[PDB]
Specification:
Layout lengths: L20 H13 L4 E6 L14 H6 L5 E5 L15 H18 L3 E5 L18 H11 L6 H16 L11 E4 L18 H18 L5 E5 L8 H4 L11 E6 L7 H22 L2 E7 L3 E2 L9 H11 L7 E4 L6 E2 L9 H8 L4 E2 L14
Parallel strand pairs: 1-2, 1-9, 1-11, 2-3, 3-4, 4-5, 5-6, 6-7, 7-9
Antiparallel strand pairs: 8-10
Amino acid sequence: GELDFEPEETRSFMVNPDATEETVALFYNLKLLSQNSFIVGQQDAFSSFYQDNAGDSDIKKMTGSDPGLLGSDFMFITDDLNDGTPSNWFFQQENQIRDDVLRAFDMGLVNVFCWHFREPFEGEHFYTSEMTQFQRENALKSILPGGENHDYYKQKLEKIASFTKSLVGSNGALVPIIFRPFHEFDGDWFWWGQSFCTIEEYIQLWQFTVTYLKNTLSVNNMLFAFSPDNRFFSESEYLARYPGDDFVDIMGMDNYGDFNNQGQAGVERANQKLKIVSDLAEERVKIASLTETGYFVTLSENGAIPGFFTNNLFEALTHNDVKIGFTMFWYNYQDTYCTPVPGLPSANDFMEFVSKPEVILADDLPEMYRLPPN
Protein backbone atom coordinates (compact mmCIF):
# COMPACT_ATOMS: atom_id res chain seq x y z
CA GLY A 1 0.00 0.00 0.00
CA GLU A 2 0.99 3.61 -0.67
CA LEU A 3 -0.14 7.03 0.59
CA ASP A 4 0.32 10.54 -0.77
CA PHE A 5 1.92 11.82 2.47
CA GLU A 6 4.86 10.78 4.64
CA PRO A 7 4.36 9.27 8.11
CA GLU A 8 6.07 12.24 9.78
CA GLU A 9 3.38 14.56 8.35
CA THR A 10 0.44 12.58 9.77
CA ARG A 11 -0.22 15.14 12.53
CA SER A 12 -1.12 17.73 9.89
CA PHE A 13 -4.12 15.58 8.83
CA MET A 14 -5.48 14.89 12.34
CA VAL A 15 -8.16 16.61 14.40
CA ASN A 16 -5.59 16.75 17.20
CA PRO A 17 -2.08 17.50 15.89
CA ASP A 18 -0.92 17.30 19.55
CA ALA A 19 -2.04 13.67 19.88
CA THR A 20 0.21 11.07 21.53
CA GLU A 21 2.72 9.31 19.31
CA GLU A 22 0.72 6.05 19.40
CA THR A 23 -2.49 7.91 18.40
CA VAL A 24 -0.69 9.46 15.41
CA ALA A 25 0.63 6.01 14.48
CA LEU A 26 -2.88 4.55 14.71
CA PHE A 27 -4.21 7.16 12.27
CA TYR A 28 -1.35 6.62 9.82
CA ASN A 29 -1.50 2.84 9.97
CA LEU A 30 -5.30 2.65 9.55
CA LYS A 31 -5.11 4.96 6.55
CA LEU A 32 -2.24 2.93 5.06
CA LEU A 33 -3.81 -0.50 5.51
CA SER A 34 -7.15 0.76 4.14
CA GLN A 35 -5.58 1.00 0.65
CA ASN A 36 -6.03 -2.74 0.24
CA SER A 37 -7.15 -4.39 3.51
CA PHE A 38 -9.35 -3.87 6.56
CA ILE A 39 -9.46 -4.89 10.22
CA VAL A 40 -12.45 -6.91 11.41
CA GLY A 41 -13.61 -6.51 14.98
CA GLN A 42 -16.60 -7.01 17.27
CA GLN A 43 -18.36 -5.09 20.03
CA ASP A 44 -17.67 -6.51 23.52
CA ALA A 45 -15.68 -9.38 22.03
CA PHE A 46 -14.05 -10.21 25.41
CA SER A 47 -17.19 -9.94 27.60
CA SER A 48 -20.29 -10.88 25.52
CA PHE A 49 -20.64 -14.36 24.08
CA TYR A 50 -23.19 -16.51 22.31
CA GLN A 51 -25.10 -18.47 24.99
CA ASP A 52 -22.85 -16.74 27.56
CA ASN A 53 -20.15 -19.36 26.90
CA ALA A 54 -17.37 -17.22 28.36
CA GLY A 55 -13.67 -17.75 27.84
CA ASP A 56 -12.09 -16.94 24.48
CA SER A 57 -13.82 -14.34 22.29
CA ASP A 58 -16.36 -15.95 19.98
CA ILE A 59 -14.25 -14.91 16.98
CA LYS A 60 -11.31 -16.83 18.49
CA LYS A 61 -13.54 -19.85 19.25
CA MET A 62 -14.52 -19.77 15.57
CA THR A 63 -11.29 -18.82 13.74
CA GLY A 64 -8.47 -19.45 16.22
CA SER A 65 -7.62 -15.72 16.20
CA ASP A 66 -8.98 -12.89 18.32
CA PRO A 67 -10.62 -10.04 16.38
CA GLY A 68 -8.36 -7.20 15.26
CA LEU A 69 -10.56 -4.58 16.90
CA LEU A 70 -12.60 -4.32 20.09
CA GLY A 71 -15.73 -2.16 20.43
CA SER A 72 -16.72 -0.78 23.84
CA ASP A 73 -19.32 1.70 25.10
CA PHE A 74 -19.14 4.72 27.42
CA MET A 75 -22.78 4.00 28.50
CA PHE A 76 -22.08 2.52 31.94
CA ILE A 77 -19.01 4.74 32.48
CA THR A 78 -21.20 7.87 32.31
CA ASP A 79 -24.27 6.57 34.14
CA ASP A 80 -25.71 8.94 36.75
CA LEU A 81 -25.50 6.14 39.29
CA ASN A 82 -21.84 5.26 38.68
CA ASP A 83 -20.20 6.47 41.91
CA GLY A 84 -16.79 5.02 41.13
CA THR A 85 -16.61 2.56 44.02
CA PRO A 86 -16.19 -1.24 44.20
CA SER A 87 -19.72 -2.07 45.41
CA ASN A 88 -21.27 -0.20 42.52
CA TRP A 89 -22.41 -2.29 39.55
CA PHE A 90 -21.83 0.47 37.00
CA PHE A 91 -18.27 0.96 38.26
CA GLN A 92 -17.77 -2.81 38.08
CA GLN A 93 -18.78 -2.61 34.39
CA GLU A 94 -16.43 0.36 33.89
CA ASN A 95 -13.56 -1.63 35.38
CA GLN A 96 -14.28 -4.67 33.22
CA ILE A 97 -14.34 -2.40 30.13
CA ARG A 98 -11.03 -0.88 31.21
CA ASP A 99 -9.46 -4.34 31.66
CA ASP A 100 -10.71 -5.52 28.23
CA VAL A 101 -9.44 -2.33 26.52
CA LEU A 102 -5.99 -2.66 28.11
CA ARG A 103 -5.91 -6.36 27.14
CA ALA A 104 -6.83 -5.39 23.58
CA PHE A 105 -4.14 -2.69 23.40
CA ASP A 106 -1.46 -5.00 24.87
CA MET A 107 -2.28 -7.48 22.07
CA GLY A 108 -2.18 -4.69 19.46
CA LEU A 109 -5.89 -4.49 18.71
CA VAL A 110 -7.64 -1.22 17.83
CA ASN A 111 -10.21 0.10 20.36
CA VAL A 112 -13.39 1.96 19.35
CA PHE A 113 -15.92 3.48 21.80
CA CYS A 114 -19.49 4.45 21.05
CA TRP A 115 -21.70 6.14 23.67
CA HIS A 116 -25.27 5.08 24.40
CA PHE A 117 -25.73 8.26 26.45
CA ARG A 118 -28.90 8.22 28.53
CA GLU A 119 -30.82 11.44 28.10
CA PRO A 120 -29.95 14.14 30.64
CA PHE A 121 -33.25 15.02 32.33
CA GLU A 122 -33.71 11.68 34.09
CA GLY A 123 -30.67 9.69 32.97
CA GLU A 124 -32.55 6.44 32.35
CA HIS A 125 -33.11 6.03 28.57
CA PHE A 126 -31.32 6.67 25.31
CA TYR A 127 -33.98 5.12 23.02
CA THR A 128 -36.60 7.72 22.14
CA SER A 129 -39.42 5.12 22.29
CA GLU A 130 -38.78 4.78 26.04
CA MET A 131 -38.67 8.46 27.02
CA THR A 132 -41.30 11.19 27.23
CA GLN A 133 -42.18 13.55 24.40
CA PHE A 134 -40.64 16.42 26.36
CA GLN A 135 -37.37 14.53 26.80
CA ARG A 136 -37.18 13.52 23.12
CA GLU A 137 -37.78 17.08 21.95
CA ASN A 138 -35.46 18.85 24.38
CA ALA A 139 -32.61 16.53 25.45
CA LEU A 140 -30.06 17.62 22.83
CA LYS A 141 -31.00 21.28 22.98
CA SER A 142 -30.56 21.13 26.77
CA ILE A 143 -26.88 20.07 26.57
CA LEU A 144 -25.75 22.85 24.22
CA PRO A 145 -24.25 26.02 25.69
CA GLY A 146 -27.16 27.91 27.24
CA GLY A 147 -29.09 24.68 27.84
CA GLU A 148 -30.27 23.79 31.32
CA ASN A 149 -28.24 20.55 31.20
CA HIS A 150 -25.00 21.99 29.79
CA ASP A 151 -23.01 21.77 33.04
CA TYR A 152 -24.33 18.21 33.47
CA TYR A 153 -23.03 17.38 30.00
CA LYS A 154 -19.62 18.94 30.70
CA GLN A 155 -19.37 16.68 33.77
CA LYS A 156 -20.06 13.63 31.59
CA LEU A 157 -17.30 14.69 29.18
CA GLU A 158 -15.00 15.17 32.17
CA LYS A 159 -15.71 11.56 33.18
CA ILE A 160 -15.00 10.36 29.63
CA ALA A 161 -11.73 12.33 29.70
CA SER A 162 -10.58 11.03 33.09
CA PHE A 163 -11.36 7.46 32.06
CA THR A 164 -9.64 7.86 28.71
CA LYS A 165 -6.51 9.47 30.20
CA SER A 166 -6.32 6.59 32.71
CA LEU A 167 -5.81 3.94 29.99
CA VAL A 168 -2.11 3.02 30.29
CA GLY A 169 -0.92 -0.12 28.48
CA SER A 170 1.63 -2.59 29.77
CA ASN A 171 4.21 -0.70 27.68
CA GLY A 172 3.55 2.52 29.62
CA ALA A 173 1.85 4.40 26.77
CA LEU A 174 -1.69 5.77 26.74
CA VAL A 175 -4.14 3.60 24.80
CA PRO A 176 -5.43 5.44 21.69
CA ILE A 177 -9.17 5.17 21.34
CA ILE A 178 -11.54 6.01 18.51
CA PHE A 179 -14.49 7.91 19.97
CA ARG A 180 -17.72 7.65 17.89
CA PRO A 181 -20.40 9.76 19.64
CA PHE A 182 -23.98 10.61 18.65
CA HIS A 183 -24.06 7.90 16.02
CA GLU A 184 -26.95 6.95 13.74
CA PHE A 185 -28.24 10.52 14.03
CA ASP A 186 -30.11 10.19 10.70
CA GLY A 187 -32.55 7.80 12.36
CA ASP A 188 -35.15 8.69 14.99
CA TRP A 189 -34.36 6.04 17.61
CA PHE A 190 -31.89 8.16 19.63
CA TRP A 191 -32.58 11.61 21.11
CA TRP A 192 -29.72 13.11 19.08
CA GLY A 193 -31.64 12.05 15.94
CA GLN A 194 -32.64 14.32 13.12
CA SER A 195 -36.30 14.83 14.09
CA PHE A 196 -35.27 16.25 17.46
CA CYS A 197 -32.64 18.85 16.55
CA THR A 198 -31.62 21.11 13.70
CA ILE A 199 -28.53 20.59 11.55
CA GLU A 200 -26.93 23.58 13.25
CA GLU A 201 -27.65 22.16 16.72
CA TYR A 202 -26.13 18.76 15.89
CA ILE A 203 -23.03 20.40 14.42
CA GLN A 204 -22.74 22.76 17.40
CA LEU A 205 -22.90 19.78 19.75
CA TRP A 206 -20.18 17.96 17.80
CA GLN A 207 -17.84 20.96 17.65
CA PHE A 208 -18.33 21.80 21.32
CA THR A 209 -17.66 18.17 22.25
CA VAL A 210 -14.46 17.79 20.24
CA THR A 211 -13.05 21.11 21.46
CA TYR A 212 -13.95 20.47 25.10
CA LEU A 213 -12.28 17.04 25.09
CA LYS A 214 -9.21 18.00 23.03
CA ASN A 215 -8.57 21.53 24.30
CA THR A 216 -10.24 22.12 27.69
CA LEU A 217 -9.60 18.59 29.01
CA SER A 218 -6.35 17.94 27.05
CA VAL A 219 -7.37 14.48 25.85
CA ASN A 220 -4.54 13.54 23.52
CA ASN A 221 -5.25 9.82 22.96
CA MET A 222 -8.48 10.12 20.93
CA LEU A 223 -9.43 9.97 17.26
CA PHE A 224 -12.96 11.12 16.38
CA ALA A 225 -15.40 9.10 14.25
CA PHE A 226 -18.58 10.42 12.58
CA SER A 227 -21.17 7.80 11.61
CA PRO A 228 -24.75 8.05 10.38
CA ASP A 229 -26.76 4.91 9.76
CA ASN A 230 -27.53 4.07 6.11
CA ARG A 231 -30.12 6.74 5.22
CA PHE A 232 -28.24 8.49 2.43
CA PHE A 233 -27.61 7.97 -1.27
CA SER A 234 -25.29 10.88 -2.06
CA GLU A 235 -22.26 12.78 -0.79
CA SER A 236 -24.45 15.81 -0.05
CA GLU A 237 -26.78 13.73 2.11
CA TYR A 238 -23.89 12.03 3.93
CA LEU A 239 -22.45 15.49 4.66
CA ALA A 240 -25.75 17.10 5.74
CA ARG A 241 -24.85 17.12 9.47
CA TYR A 242 -21.08 16.71 9.08
CA PRO A 243 -19.31 19.10 11.47
CA GLY A 244 -16.26 19.79 9.35
CA ASP A 245 -12.88 18.37 8.42
CA ASP A 246 -11.32 20.02 11.51
CA PHE A 247 -13.58 17.86 13.71
CA VAL A 248 -13.59 14.34 12.20
CA ASP A 249 -10.81 11.76 11.73
CA ILE A 250 -12.86 8.70 10.70
CA MET A 251 -15.78 8.89 8.28
CA GLY A 252 -18.03 5.96 9.10
CA MET A 253 -21.50 4.58 8.58
CA ASP A 254 -23.57 1.86 10.23
CA ASN A 255 -25.45 -0.56 8.00
CA TYR A 256 -27.66 -3.45 9.04
CA GLY A 257 -30.70 -2.65 6.91
CA ASP A 258 -29.17 -3.28 3.49
CA PHE A 259 -28.04 -6.72 4.71
CA ASN A 260 -31.34 -7.76 6.35
CA ASN A 261 -32.51 -10.36 3.82
CA GLN A 262 -32.48 -7.75 1.03
CA GLY A 263 -30.75 -9.84 -1.63
CA GLN A 264 -28.20 -8.58 -4.12
CA ALA A 265 -30.12 -5.29 -4.39
CA GLY A 266 -29.33 -4.62 -0.73
CA VAL A 267 -25.71 -5.64 -1.23
CA GLU A 268 -25.48 -3.12 -4.09
CA ARG A 269 -27.00 -0.34 -1.96
CA ALA A 270 -24.53 -1.14 0.83
CA ASN A 271 -21.58 -0.99 -1.57
CA GLN A 272 -22.77 2.27 -3.16
CA LYS A 273 -23.17 3.96 0.21
CA LEU A 274 -19.79 2.72 1.47
CA LYS A 275 -18.18 3.96 -1.78
CA ILE A 276 -19.50 7.44 -1.03
CA VAL A 277 -17.86 7.31 2.41
CA SER A 278 -14.68 5.85 0.92
CA ASP A 279 -14.53 8.52 -1.81
CA LEU A 280 -14.96 11.34 0.71
CA ALA A 281 -12.29 9.85 2.98
CA GLU A 282 -9.88 9.73 0.03
CA GLU A 283 -10.65 13.35 -0.89
CA ARG A 284 -10.44 14.72 2.69
CA VAL A 285 -7.56 12.53 3.95
CA LYS A 286 -9.78 10.69 6.46
CA ILE A 287 -10.12 7.00 7.35
CA ALA A 288 -13.32 5.39 6.06
CA SER A 289 -15.12 2.62 7.95
CA LEU A 290 -18.26 0.52 8.14
CA THR A 291 -18.45 1.16 11.89
CA GLU A 292 -21.32 -1.31 12.65
CA THR A 293 -22.72 -4.15 10.58
CA GLY A 294 -24.05 -7.67 10.85
CA TYR A 295 -27.00 -9.93 10.18
CA PHE A 296 -28.46 -11.11 13.49
CA VAL A 297 -29.43 -14.80 13.69
CA THR A 298 -31.73 -16.24 16.37
CA LEU A 299 -32.24 -19.88 15.41
CA SER A 300 -35.72 -20.13 17.01
CA GLU A 301 -36.82 -17.19 14.81
CA ASN A 302 -34.64 -16.88 11.68
CA GLY A 303 -31.82 -18.72 9.94
CA ALA A 304 -28.50 -17.72 8.41
CA ILE A 305 -28.37 -16.12 4.95
CA PRO A 306 -26.45 -18.50 2.64
CA GLY A 307 -23.10 -16.98 1.71
CA PHE A 308 -23.79 -13.86 3.79
CA PHE A 309 -20.19 -13.18 4.78
CA THR A 310 -18.38 -14.23 1.63
CA ASN A 311 -20.86 -13.16 -1.07
CA ASN A 312 -22.75 -10.27 0.55
CA LEU A 313 -20.72 -8.47 3.22
CA PHE A 314 -17.32 -9.09 1.63
CA GLU A 315 -18.54 -7.87 -1.75
CA ALA A 316 -19.99 -4.69 -0.26
CA LEU A 317 -16.68 -4.05 1.57
CA THR A 318 -14.48 -4.47 -1.50
CA HIS A 319 -16.27 -4.03 -4.85
CA ASN A 320 -15.48 -0.92 -6.88
CA ASP A 321 -12.25 -0.17 -4.98
CA VAL A 322 -13.82 0.70 -1.60
CA LYS A 323 -11.05 1.62 0.90
CA ILE A 324 -11.91 1.23 4.60
CA GLY A 325 -9.69 0.89 7.65
CA PHE A 326 -12.00 -1.36 9.63
CA THR A 327 -15.42 -2.86 10.06
CA MET A 328 -17.08 -4.03 13.27
CA PHE A 329 -19.83 -6.50 14.08
CA TRP A 330 -22.23 -5.85 16.93
CA TYR A 331 -22.03 -8.16 19.94
CA ASN A 332 -23.20 -11.75 20.26
CA TYR A 333 -25.59 -12.16 23.18
CA GLN A 334 -27.66 -15.04 24.58
CA ASP A 335 -29.34 -16.83 21.63
CA THR A 336 -28.60 -14.12 19.06
CA TYR A 337 -25.37 -13.99 17.11
CA CYS A 338 -23.92 -12.05 14.26
CA THR A 339 -20.63 -13.92 14.18
CA PRO A 340 -20.81 -17.73 14.41
CA VAL A 341 -19.06 -20.23 16.64
CA PRO A 342 -18.32 -23.77 15.52
CA GLY A 343 -21.32 -25.88 14.65
CA LEU A 344 -23.60 -22.93 13.98
CA PRO A 345 -25.06 -22.13 10.60
CA SER A 346 -22.73 -19.66 8.75
CA ALA A 347 -19.56 -21.00 10.39
CA ASN A 348 -17.95 -22.19 7.15
CA ASP A 349 -19.03 -19.06 5.31
CA PHE A 350 -17.41 -16.96 8.04
CA MET A 351 -14.20 -18.96 7.77
CA GLU A 352 -14.08 -18.37 4.07
CA PHE A 353 -14.63 -14.65 4.65
CA VAL A 354 -11.89 -14.27 7.29
CA SER A 355 -9.48 -16.22 5.09
CA LYS A 356 -9.69 -13.56 2.36
CA PRO A 357 -6.38 -11.68 2.07
CA GLU A 358 -8.11 -8.33 2.71
CA VAL A 359 -9.32 -9.41 6.18
CA ILE A 360 -7.09 -8.59 9.19
CA LEU A 361 -7.75 -10.32 12.56
CA ALA A 362 -5.48 -10.19 15.63
CA ASP A 363 -3.03 -12.76 14.28
CA ASP A 364 -2.23 -10.69 11.19
CA LEU A 365 -2.40 -7.21 12.69
CA PRO A 366 0.42 -4.82 11.75
CA GLU A 367 2.13 -2.91 14.55
CA MET A 368 -0.54 -0.22 14.54
CA TYR A 369 1.02 1.95 17.22
CA ARG A 370 4.48 2.39 15.68
CA LEU A 371 5.03 5.03 13.04
CA PRO A 372 7.37 3.86 10.27
CA PRO A 373 10.23 6.12 9.16
CA ASN A 374 9.97 8.27 6.05
